[PDB]
Amino acid sequence: SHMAHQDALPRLPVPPLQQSLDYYLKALQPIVSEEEWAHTKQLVDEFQTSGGVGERLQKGLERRAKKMENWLSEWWLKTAYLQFRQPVVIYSSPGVILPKQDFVDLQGQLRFAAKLIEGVLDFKSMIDNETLPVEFLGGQPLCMNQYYQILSSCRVPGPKQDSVVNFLKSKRPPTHITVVHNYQFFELDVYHSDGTPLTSDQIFVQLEKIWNSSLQSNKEPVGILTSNHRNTWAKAYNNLIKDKVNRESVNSIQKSIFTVCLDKQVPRVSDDVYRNHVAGQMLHGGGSKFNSGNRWFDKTLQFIVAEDGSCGMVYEHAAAEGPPIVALVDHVMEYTKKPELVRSPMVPLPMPKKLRFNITPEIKNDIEKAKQNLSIMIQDLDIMMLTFHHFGKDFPKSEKLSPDAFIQVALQLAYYRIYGQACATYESASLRMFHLGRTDTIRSASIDSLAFVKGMGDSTVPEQQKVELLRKAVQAHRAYTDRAIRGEAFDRHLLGLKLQAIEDLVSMPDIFMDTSYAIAMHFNLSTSQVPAKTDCVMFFGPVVPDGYGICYNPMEAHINFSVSAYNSCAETNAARMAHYLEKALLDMRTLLQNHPRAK
Ligand SMILES: CC(C)(COP(=O)(O)OP(=O)(O)OC[C@H]1O[C@@H](n2cnc3c(N)ncnc32)[C@H](O)[C@@H]1OP(=O)(O)O)[C@@H](O)C(=O)NCCC(=O)NCCS
Ligand SMILES: C[N+](C)(C)C[C@H](O)CC(=O)O
Description:
The PDB classes it as transferase. About 45% of the residues lie in helices and about 15% in strands. The chain is built from 20 helices and 16 strands. The protein has an eight-stranded mixed sheet, with helices on both faces. Strand 6, helix 10 (about 275-285) and strand 7 form a beta-alpha-beta unit. Helix 6 packs across helix 7 and helix 14 crosses helix 20 (about 575-595).
């Protein structure tokens, strides 16, 4: 981003060794047996003794911070995404459901799409001009690098690890987006010769041509290849681009500013599961029989516009976190609401280039293999969307409690009520106050959270006593949060020590092969908060076979929740988890209301 800004920002720190190990042991107590804790406790003491293993690894990290702009950046990008071989669909790329639009006919659908494209191009203006406003997370300026990674970029399949291409700052920045309709991709320029952006009306006229140039779904859904295992896609990709035409088409897709998906009508479903289906549409496409083939999941930004009014998006995670994405959404959405003005006549426009794909028996086979893979993925996904209308940040705030901590504590209560024990819990923490900062881990399962969940369901504990435990759990969570955004958490630090050991060519410390670390890094609950002015909601699949993926947008009067699970694990159920979460939130409000503070 703006160089002047990025330079004034502090570099990612390396927390003290003893400090992090201290927090580690604390966060483990509620999720591991006493026997395992005692053992882990021993490993830690040795690991940090003077002239020991840990001390040496720690020095390595500090040297790393001196030789790099961010000691964690590259390591995190590779281990979290580039080296993650599972399909990006569901397992990595978050999906987003935006507010349903009122268009009723195809003309309105395209009308909205054109407005959306224009809105994005407007946001891009600030990016190219480095005029994008400065953000804060608590009186501290935040890194804006992520904003210069989302547009005109794409992920690229690699035989061993993937890579990412960014053409935003290339010699001749791309001036075209890509539009997908009935599995067919089209290259569309959204800028004039002079360099001015096309207007909503102009873009509309073009979208009309595009739609009529692909009225039927008779072409192979080549885009579905992008939803397969990364290793498999890497080989299919390499073969796919052997053809000049194919290579040319893929190239346009990768360089395009962003992709717009014009989804077709899908089989009407029961109103009680409608939202869950739309969520599926945005996350994976619904299947090879619906809209999954009308996408290119390597593309950083994909905006989806259904024909029934539904709209949303799915983005490739290597590029950024939710905040930057929603900032873009809030701007675009608010832009689509801007009234009209001088609808002067516009001169003829060129015909959008159709990105053809020469299919061969080998490619066809890859496509079919991709369809089968995706079917298995989809069928195994259990999604439940929950709109918590009872209240939002309003209640927790009136109680002088952090809404996010209130929600996280509520989730811990719900989980305990179901399984009778706590579990490793992950919550995304933004480290953007640091140059190139991405995230760290806030662990919601703690000593105080466990003390609360137990006392809460205890029919022998005074209701007033449960209130104290509640506030203490929330405060303990707020504290952890404050430390996390300040680079004082320990998860990324511990990962760094492990990676430092590998690089130092020294044996893997037992502390990392310890059963406790395995449990600690096996997140049965993987979560994140993605606040937005737009009444939208995000979602993603669980990070472990027996876990849940929960995301939420805390609004003032309500909270948009998404809960995912895998059907392969009989012990988990999205609907049930959502129900217990709704009830945990209500029960906590009831407890606090029953015992007011003032007088
Ligand atoms: C962890 C994190 C979500 C906490 O954010 P937060 O804004 O501090 O959340 P809180 O619930 O504490 O605060 C929300 C609101 O309640 C208020 N509040 C907090 N504590 C309060 C209290 N004790 N009493 C009254 N109000 C309080 C805040 O001022 C804020 O006010 P607002 O509604 O006017 O903005 C944030 O630090 C973060 O890391 N966000 C990014 C997460 C991310 O990366 N997500 C995407 C991952 S892909
Ligand atoms: C979805 N989840 C929590 C697994 C990953 C976050 O989106 C990103 C992060 O916390 O690094």
